[PDB]
């Protein structure tokens, strides 16, 4: 095992002031770590914990390469679409996982941070797009959607709509419409020299 000893951030990802909106999600690279996954085992009553290819009880017993953790926020009972191999409104235009995955899908139902009580218009998501996305692709352009054969000069009119739309989270809608901070974490097994390893002598 390598002789590195410094801890690396699993506290600047799960404990963050503001997650990125789903249409433009934020990706972080984790490397050169003595990585222990026991810190996130409790972390409030997880609404979802599925790792798709490795038992979560044995994660600090393996050495990975180029771990990538990326996070965003979801409307509510919609994190069902983050599983691989299924389609939907948000798995087609916002974020799509491949058919083969090797990562966990932690999500933990924050409502005391992402719900103002007033008007919350800083969490957007794409609604209109010509074609479906591609696995692990980010679309960031804000251009006027054109659902027709007539060119658009840059203003909203007939079949000349706008793609982005706000969520407007409220502390009243219950559980179906209630913000969900989501973090997915993909890692590739040993093919190259290892950089991230668990704690072992």
């Amino acid at each position, epitope marked *: 095992f390598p002789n590195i000893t410094n801890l690396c951030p699993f506290d600047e990802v799960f404990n963050a002031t503001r997650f990125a909106s789903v249409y433009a999600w934020n990706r972080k690279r984790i490397s050169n770590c003595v990585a222990d996954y026991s810190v996130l085992y409790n972390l409030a009553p997880f609404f979802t914990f599925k790792c798709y290819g490795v038992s979560p009880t044995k994660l600090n017993d393996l050495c990975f390469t180029n771990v990538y953790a990326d996070s965003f926020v979801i409307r509510g009972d919609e994190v069902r679409q983050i599983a691989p191999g299924q389609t939907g409104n948000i798995a087609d235009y916002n974020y799509k996982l491949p058919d083969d995955f090797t990562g966990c899908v932690i999500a933990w139902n924050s409502n005391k941070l992402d719900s103002k009580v007033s008007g919350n218009y800083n969490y957007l998501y794409r609604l209109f797009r010509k074609s479906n996305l591609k696995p692990f692709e980010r679309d960031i352009s804000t251009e006027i959607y054109q659902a027709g054969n007539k060119p658009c000069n840059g203003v909203a009119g*007939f079949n000349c709509y*706008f793609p982005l739309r706000s969520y407007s989270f409220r502390p009243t809608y219950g559980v179906g419409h209630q913000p969900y901070r989501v973090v997915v974490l993909s890692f590739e097994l040993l093919h190259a020299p290892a950089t991230v390893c668990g704690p072992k002598k």
Partner: antibody
Amino acid sequence: QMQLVQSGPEVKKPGTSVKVSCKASGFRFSISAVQWVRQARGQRLEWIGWIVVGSGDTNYAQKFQERVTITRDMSTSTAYMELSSLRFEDTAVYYCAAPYCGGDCSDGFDIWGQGTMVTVSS
Amino acid sequence: EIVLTQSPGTLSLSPGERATLSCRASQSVSSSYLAWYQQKPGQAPRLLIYGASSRATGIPDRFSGSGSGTDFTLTISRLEPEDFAVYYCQQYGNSPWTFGQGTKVEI
């Protein structure tokens, strides 16, 4: 594409409110936009307002600004228009129009409903 | 508000002749947003020409349509005995979207 199915005739009294439903089937309703039109007996057509199905944004005329409300239901695939504070001049036939929009919209309202008659009597 | 004046008020052509209609506009409107509808007595209107130049699907080549800017015209080559209805013109470029007066074609 099939002409949008519209509700049946209504007879109301002045003061109350009425609701008209427009059900769409046979084409991709998730991109199209629905406009509402009123016509009296043997008179010119009048414009009420239009709504985007996906976004839900509405637009009305300066006369119907504070009397009509247009909403839609995606799961049922319907468009509803509620008109309140009926008067003697509100008795007419209402039409529902949308473009036949599959993979690409038709650039014109070529699908029209059969029309619903509302009579404000006493 | 955009105001559309449709002329002439009434047409009295025998069948088999040439028919012309005009939909003059108060202000300039994009040629990409203008439609001509036909209205039979006691029936819903139907779309004939959209975009001021392109016919709708399943429409005979008799109806042509032309014009741009502030002058739009509709032309019918031969009057079938079923082409006697009320013709409206509607612009949907900028809100509000306003119809026309209507032109009646008789025998």
